[PDB]
Amino acid sequence: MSHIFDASVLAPHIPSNLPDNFKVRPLAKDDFSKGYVDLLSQLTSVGNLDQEAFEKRFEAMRTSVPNYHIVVIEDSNSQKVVASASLVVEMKFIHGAGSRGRVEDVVVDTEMRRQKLGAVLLKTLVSLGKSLGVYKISLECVPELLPFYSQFGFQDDCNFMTQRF
Amino acid sequence: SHIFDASVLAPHIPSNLPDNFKVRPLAKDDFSKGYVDLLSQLTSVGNLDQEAFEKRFEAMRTSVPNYHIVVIEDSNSQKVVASASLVVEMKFIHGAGSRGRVEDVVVDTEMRRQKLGAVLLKTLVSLGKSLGVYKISLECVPELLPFYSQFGFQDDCNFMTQRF
Ligand SMILES: *SCCNC(=O)CCNC(=O)[C@H](O)C(C)(C)COP(=O)(O)OP(=O)(O)OC[C@H]1O[C@@H](n2cnc3c(N)ncnc32)[C@H](O)[C@@H]1OP(=O)(O)O
Ligand SMILES: *SCCNC(=O)CCNC(=O)[C@H](O)C(C)(C)COP(=O)(O)OP(=O)(O)OC[C@H]1O[C@@H](n2cnc3c(N)ncnc32)[C@H](O)[C@@H]1OP(=O)(O)O
């Protein structure tokens, strides 16, 4: 039904190099029925997420400002969501009330990999976050993904700490 | 106008800190208590005047999850001398879980090595656990390992960044 953010803000950022069966768009409320939770399960554990919790969380995200820019790719051949990536923006006071962007939950369906859907999403989100005015954008991942992330500007960084246990 | 609720902060503030220090949420009038001069000791604050401060503070105060910005005010100067933020990212993964990030940690240069930084980290790790976050992280510099290792944190280089 509804989109998690306005598809008009995303439109200028979507590249043009994907086959016509791919549609890049905001997550939508009825993407549960399009396999979104199955997609997330390929990334990590979804725990007890079910459709009611998915819809409630989707509403909470949809009313947030800055928006949760959760961008998906729907394969029109199957009408399933086959890729997802999130650009989440934290408001700051530093840098003149600037914004700090993070690219999270990046996943492409395992059968659909090496068709460029991953690069399309990271390119779209990097362009969206620059346009939004973010001063710093980051990705938490293993950069075995070296070739991949660097061509969009990301550099290895170790100014990040997690808990030991 | 407080950025988040003092009653939520209360159980996580450690005991018997010296009495010239008050640990509390960031307040809209903290601009007049030297908040910008404190943040400058962390990085460029740009042209953050009172009007822009207040516009941004209100945008953050109405966001859910809240921006858990905790500051320490010193009596002996009536100035904000320390600040740290716990910012919470909603997820769908982990049962519509939530991810906590400790950010913008800074103690005024004249007030360092009096445990203010430690109080802020203990407070925010305890508050993040209460909020039910499944993972918490810190962004800091590796040179400061002898500080952050005291609150469970260790360096994690599965991270990439760029400045625009
Ligand atoms: S932690 C953040 C990343 N998310 C995950 O790691 C979750 C699981 N992995 C994925 O969902 C996908 O494997 C990701 C990493 C999102 C990649 O998506 P795509 O497969 O759609 O990537 P592209 O087709 O756009 O790939 C472009 C370039 O990526 C490099 N590359 C991808 N995968 C590999 C592997 N497996 N081994 C070596 N290199 C890989 C290549 O430079 C690739 O260009 P090619 O023309 O495909 O060689
Ligand atoms: S996450 C940090 C990113 N922020 C900054 O880099 C901003 C500039 N730095 C600061 O604001 C302060 O130096 C920080 C890093 C916030 C620490 O604040 P405090 O000065 O209040 O620290 P504590 O008194 O709580 O220190 C507790 C123990 O941590 C170690 N420690 C603090 N500072 C250092 C330095 N610079 N180098 C090595 N260790 C440091 C000490 O073990 C300290 O215990 P002592 O009992 O003082 O030795």
Residue numbers in the entry:
A (entry chain A): 1 to 165
B (entry chain B): 2 to 165
List sentences from the manuscript.
Glucosamine-6-phosphate N-acetyltransferase 1 (GNA1) produces GlcNAc-6-phosphate from GlcN-6-phosphate and acetyl coenzyme A. Early mercury-labelling experiments implicated a conserved cysteine in the reaction mechanism, whereas recent structural data appear to support a mechanism in which this cysteine plays no role. GNA1 is a member of the Gcn5-related N-acetyltransferase (GNAT) superfamily.
In the structure of the covalent CoA complex the cysteine has shifted (maximum atom shifts of 4.0 Å for the side chain and 2.0 Å for the backbone) and rotated (124° around χ1) from its buried position into an exposed position on the wall of the active site, positioning it at a distance of 2.0 Å from the CoA thiol. Further significant conformational changes have also taken place. Tyr149, the residue that is thought to stabilize the negative charge developed on the CoA thiol in the proposed reaction mechanism, has rotated away from the active site (130° around χ1). A control protein sample taken immediately after purification had a mean mass of 18 876 ± 36 Da, whereas the protein from the dissolved crystals showed a mean mass of 19 654 ± 21 Da. The calculated difference mass of 777 Da is compatible with the theoretical mass of CoA (768 Da).
